[PDB]
Amino acid sequence: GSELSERIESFVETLKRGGGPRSSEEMARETLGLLRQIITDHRWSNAGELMELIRREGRRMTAAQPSETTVGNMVRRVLKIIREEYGRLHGHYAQLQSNIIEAINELLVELEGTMENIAAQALEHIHSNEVIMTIGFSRTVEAFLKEAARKRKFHVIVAECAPFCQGHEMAVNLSKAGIETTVMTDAAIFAVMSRVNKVIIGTKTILANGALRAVTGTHTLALAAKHHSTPLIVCAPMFKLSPQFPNEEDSFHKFVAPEEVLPFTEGDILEKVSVHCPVFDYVPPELITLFISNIGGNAPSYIYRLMSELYHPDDHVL
Amino acid sequence: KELIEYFKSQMKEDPDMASAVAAIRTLLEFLKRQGLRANLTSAIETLCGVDSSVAVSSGGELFLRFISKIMIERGELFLRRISLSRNKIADLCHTFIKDGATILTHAYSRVVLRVLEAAVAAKKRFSVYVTESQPDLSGKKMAKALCHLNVPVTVVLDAAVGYIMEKADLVIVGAEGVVENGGIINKIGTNQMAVCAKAQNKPFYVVAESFKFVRLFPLNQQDVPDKFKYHPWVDYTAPSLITLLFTDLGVLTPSAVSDELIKLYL
Amino acid sequence: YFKSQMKEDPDMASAVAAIRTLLEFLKRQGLRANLTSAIETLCGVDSSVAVSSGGELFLRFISSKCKKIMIERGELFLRRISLSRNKIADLCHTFIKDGATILTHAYSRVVLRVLEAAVAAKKRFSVYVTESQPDLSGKKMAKALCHLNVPVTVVLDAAVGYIMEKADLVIVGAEGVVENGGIINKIGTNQMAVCAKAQNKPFYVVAESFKFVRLFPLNQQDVPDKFKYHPWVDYTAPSLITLLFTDLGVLTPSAVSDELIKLYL
């Protein structure tokens, strides 16, 4: 299947060059579709060959971009599906393909439904005349906020990100719905984190110990929340949950060109000054209050069980 | 009793064999020699009397639970599986040590020694600080065994754990027994080190095997049974001061041990 | 100068002995140089914060044909320093309860005087003492306290956190009080203060006025290395101290800085 190899190479290049789709849901859906296509257009007799081929492909896709913790999750999910199916049929080498495809489709439809599954739980935690603040821009949190703005009324404060000011789009989108949102810088968090009653944010990846690898600036927000004793909620689907711990990992953050921090038109001082631009950061589990998932809320202390349920322990290394 | 004879035999023949492993080995060896359940409970009390440690009691409880033709098979398999718990814990914990980090270790323990021996084998460099453990000078033995591996060890004073806490990147200590709530029963000088580590946001890691899970829930230093303390020898550390746990079952959080115990039902 | 025997009689602290030696050597401007010479020599024998504190206090007090006023002031200051301990004990013995449990780290004449003044008031209490592994002074303190008809108990240095819940208050002596309010005491003081802070246990400190040293340690390394020398002293932040019982009265950790500023040391 040379066309399959071409699609795989294009995906790897767009992921390593400038990333795939802009939102994480589309990224996960495209990864799962590519995995389904690989499973369909390929020859194999035993499940071991298929699973090791998928392992190699996922290893390649992860080496293309290690900071994109959305494709490895789909690869591990497909591997777990294959293993569960093989154990159910053997606990087999002629009709294992169609059932894998059916399972993958079942996973796809719920992948799409995750957004509504999350947004439906907005009225359980938001009350009238509440003061909530957020940082960055996330579709999940945007829906979670604008879904309860029809019957409930509250105040929203959006803190922009210094390297890439992405909170402006979120503030504009929330103001278009009439939620009385306010815009501020990421340097006035602690200054205003005294009249706030709750915090809701979105993350990029959930580690195994209940930690978050979100955009740079959320660790300080969590520290200020824990100092002021304000519940900090994280709304993230299950595909943003990886079986890896904070340490035991190099290249945790993503370092981009210093152009966003210090422009190229400064002068000669750029030869002496050393500039670093981290995109993500690490947030320990002790500063998290609740996890709003597709299966309802959950405390940070109950993430290991979801890990054991979703992924296989032998597939953590991949 | 010949039970104590066999226990001392297993303890002296193998110097690095843990106490609970030797107790389980003696129990399985005597099993070859209903009515059986009381016979075993009796063996476990004499053994427990000779060595007053939580590990032996936990191992005996786990063995009896395993006892409730097939038992010899399951027991041999269990012994062989628990034999490699040290390597299983090392291969998972030695990766949490990064270059340039300072280690703060408590009194001698074979598991942390194995973890460090595996870490240094991976072309790594770090510094260690061992506490003297005044009750019995075993920390000096740990420092000796570490310097024997070409690592810059440094023996510190039992009352200086707070003075060098700022010069430590992480803390890795052993455990005599993991209580149901995630706490740990360790040397008497362990509860004071964890408090300082928490006061300075220092990662407090704990290394323990799976046979050290015990169905105990002490609310303070008094709820600990006196048969384990006897100048007490051990103390209880709350789970709020522990960051993570490295066991043969995998890296666990302070709360996963309660789930495991509930799954096992004592 | 002469040998370390002005301390032939034991009671007397090292700082008071150094002050007496300095005052007597003054009876032998250009004084300053000679005196600095003297304080420095004196300090070779004793790497202690109290000696340096007393020396700096005497140097500030010195601040030369009018030597009558200086000698009279030195005599009065020495008498006041001698009466220091009775005042400290009489003012601190009121914070001890009948049946309460007390926790002490190492041997100190001030805490011993406080305990004896409290037991002289028909009070009954139990005291826990740390063995002081560096030098076995906790056993000496327990022996000197068992004679006063007090149920003393000796615990290991590593078991300070095991008996912290049983103790009701913590009282210890300080070799030197830093400007911010902290104290420079035995190596096993910071960990005890930290363990007490985690359980809302009061942490009281007793010290004289000649131990107010004008330092500002930021951490365990900012302290001078000459005082530490297996270190023999550590620093304790003022956030872990409840009150300070000195000859000037009962003050808070944020009051010694006011005294040092008024002194312009």
Side-chain angles (χ1 to χ4, degrees), chain B residues 55-63 65 68 71 75 77-79 81-87 89-109 111-122 124 126-149 152-167:
Chain B
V56 174
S57 175
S58 308
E61 289 177 355
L62 284 157
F63 172 82
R65 176 60 173 81
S68 73
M71 192 58 206
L77 266 63
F78 174 59
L79 283 176
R81 208 276 183 186
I82 209 78
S83 183
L84 58 98
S85 304
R86 215 107 68 183
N87 309 122
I89 297 158
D91 300 1
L92 300 169
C93 168
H94 96 275
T95 70
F96 276 72
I97 311 175
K98 51 89 168 178
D99 255 11
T102 307
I103 314 301
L104 174 54
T105 311
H106 211 45
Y108 169 77
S109 85
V111 194
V112 80
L113 185 136
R114 194 73 58 78
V115 172
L116 293 173
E117 181 184 338
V120 301
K124 285 184 166 183
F126 48 81
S127 306
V128 199
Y129 282 116
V130 190
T131 312
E132 61 182 4
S133 64
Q134 183 50 221
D136 60 329
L137 288 309
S138 61
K140 299 183 179 300
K141 178 181 167 184
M142 181 60 180
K144 189 214 299 181
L146 248 57
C147 192
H148 178 274
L149 268 44
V153 79
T154 298
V155 178
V156 289
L157 221 48
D158 215 330
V161 292
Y163 173 85
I164 64 178
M165 182 53 61
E166 65 190 32
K167 292 183 287 299

Side-chain angles (χ1 to χ4, degrees), chain A residues 1-198:
Chain A
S2 147
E3 71 288 351
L4 176 62
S5 309
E6 182 57 274
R7 270 288 301 98
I8 292 157
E9 290 293 80
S10 175
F11 181 70
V12 166
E13 289 296 79
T14 187
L15 194 68
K16 175 163 61 179
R17 189 171 297 154
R22 318 306 293 268
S23 100
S24 52
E25 175 262 295
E26 274 153 38
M27 183 75 74
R29 181 149 40 73
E30 190 186 20
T31 308
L32 195 50
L34 178 60
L35 281 154
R36 181 248 300 285
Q37 192 176 3
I38 294 161
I39 293 160
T40 318
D41 308 74
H42 219 123
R43 284 266 59 81
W44 77 93
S45 35
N46 309 74
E49 279 63 13
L50 177 61
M51 77 189 307
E52 74 88 6
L53 167 63
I54 292 170
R55 277 171 163 277
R56 163 158 40 84
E57 297 286 73
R59 195 148 47 198
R60 257 204 66 186
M61 283 186 291
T62 50
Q65 232 298 351
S67 183
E68 212 76 3
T69 38
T70 322
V71 307
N73 308 140
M74 298 295 98
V75 175
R76 292 188 190 92
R77 279 265 62 201
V78 168
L79 286 162
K80 182 70 181 179
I81 288 161
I82 293 168
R83 292 202 84 166
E84 283 171 10
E85 209 180 280
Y86 181 74
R88 287 168 63 267
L89 289 186
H90 188 244
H92 30 54
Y93 295 140
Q95 62 281 347
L96 190 74
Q97 190 172 189
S98 314
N99 322 281
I100 287 163
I101 300 288
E102 294 292 351
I104 291 162
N105 298 325
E106 290 172 18
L107 173 57
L108 278 159
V109 297
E110 63 178 28
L111 202 167
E112 185 167 15
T114 57
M115 191 70 74
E116 313 306 335
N117 293 351
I118 294 287
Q121 311 179 24
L123 295 317
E124 302 183 6
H125 315 271
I126 309 182
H127 64 273
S128 62
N129 289 334
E130 196 174 12
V131 184
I132 313 183
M133 68 175 294
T134 177
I135 191 177
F137 168 52
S138 188
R139 314 308 205 285
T140 311
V141 183
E142 192 190 22
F144 191 93
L145 270 170
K146 80 202 303 183
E147 192 273 349
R150 295 93 61 84
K151 60 209 79 175
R152 302 287 171 78
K153 178 54 60 178
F154 44 81
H155 189 288
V156 191
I157 303 171
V158 184
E160 76 196 31
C161 286
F164 330 104
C165 293
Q166 217 162 333
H168 295 170
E169 298 111 30
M170 197 180 188
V172 166
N173 295 15
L174 294 184
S175 75
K176 284 180 177 181
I179 316 197
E180 217 283 61
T181 192
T182 306
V183 197
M184 68 176 198
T185 41
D186 43 12
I189 288 170
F190 181 83
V192 309
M193 205 149 195
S194 66
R195 272 58 188 168
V196 168
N197 320 329
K198 194 167 285 192

